[PDB]
Amino acid sequence: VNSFSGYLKLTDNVYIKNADIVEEAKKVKPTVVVNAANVYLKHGGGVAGALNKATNNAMQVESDDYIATNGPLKVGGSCVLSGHNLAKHCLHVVGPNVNKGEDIQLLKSAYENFNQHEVLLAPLLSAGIFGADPIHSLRVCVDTVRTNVYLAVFDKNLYDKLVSSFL
Ligand SMILES: O=C(O)c1ncccc1O
């Protein structure tokens, strides 16, 4: 049993809810919240900008020190950093950004990072301002992630379309 409430069950291991991931993290304090990161961990907008704002910019300060030490992530890669006031840990995962011309086949690699964590609160990778089709992102999630993932979908219209169209 866990703390997640009001989710629709899609499969054995994937759950979905119309929710603001920031507000969901604040309520649940999950072990792991996933950030929709870029390779530079520049948390300007989208999910990343919202998570970082909720940490009062402490996520960005920590991220800048990580990049200064380790250099950029890979597209499809991830790193584990603090969850600050939102979670124990934040898993920063870089999905391909279609609006930068990145290979959508890297979306599966991105989701494979989730398998290193037993339970996660996450957004749909490469959705929103990363430009991928969210229906596709949900299909890759279900077909890649084997651990227990709680997907918070910010937009109600998109949530309803994702549920209605789910095979
Ligand atoms: O549902 C999303 O894609 C989302 N986007 C931006 C900020 C928070 C979110 O949960």
From Swiss-Prot:
Effect of residue 164 to L: In strain: Gamma/P.1
Coiled coil regions, renumbered to chain: none
Domain named Macro: residues: 1-167
Lipid bilayer topology: Multi-pass membrane protein
Catalyzed reactions per annotation: Thiol-dependent hydrolysis of ester, thioester, amide, peptide and isopeptide bonds formed by the C-terminal Gly of ubiquitin (a 76-residue protein attached to proteins as an intracellular targeting signal)
Regulation (activators, inhibitors): Inhibited in vitro by GRL-0617.
Compartments in which it is found: Host endoplasmic reticulum membrane
Resulting phenotype, residue 31 to A: In strain: Mu/B.1.621
Function: Responsible for the cleavages located at the N-terminus of the replicase polyprotein. Participates together with nsp4 in the assembly of virally-induced cytoplasmic double-membrane vesicles necessary for viral replication. Antagonizes innate immune induction of type I interferon by blocking the phosphorylation, dimerization and subsequent nuclear translocation of host IRF3. Also prevents host NF-kappa-B signaling. In addition, PL-PRO possesses a deubiquitinating/deISGylating activity and processes both 'Lys-48'- and 'Lys-63'-linked polyubiquitin chains from cellular substrates.
Subunit structure: May form homohexamers. Interacts with N protein.
Protein name: Papain-like protease nsp3
Gene coding for it: rep
